[PDB]
Ligand SMILES: [Cl-]
Ligand SMILES: [Zn+2]
């Protein structure tokens with residue numbers, strides 16, 4: 013798996029600002045119910061949906077991505093609602109994420 017930096021600018025949907033994805037997981041949840049994890053004891057926060065055409069998709073977020081950090085806050089052992097809260101601060105227009113993603117990128121040049 014690889015680490016990836018993702019930056020998402022929220023889109024104003026009337027009065028709300030939204031990122032355009034859904035989360036699952038958290039240390040309060042039963043990790044057996046998470047289909048995206050490789051290890052079914054992983055209680056981490058996973059991207060379970062990405063809204064087509066939305067800010068997260070355009071920013072490069074992918075379904076199954078594990079969210080490790082949001083704006084400098086570590087997300088590996090947070091509750092589901094703690095994750096929600098960190099992602100939905102009305103004050104914050106931009107969310108910067110570190111995610112892990114399970115995986116020829118070699119640039120080759122003729123001379
Ligand atoms: Cl919750
Ligand atoms: Zn698309």
Ligand SMILES: [Zn+2]
Nearest residue numbers: 019020021106
């Ligand atoms: Zn910006």
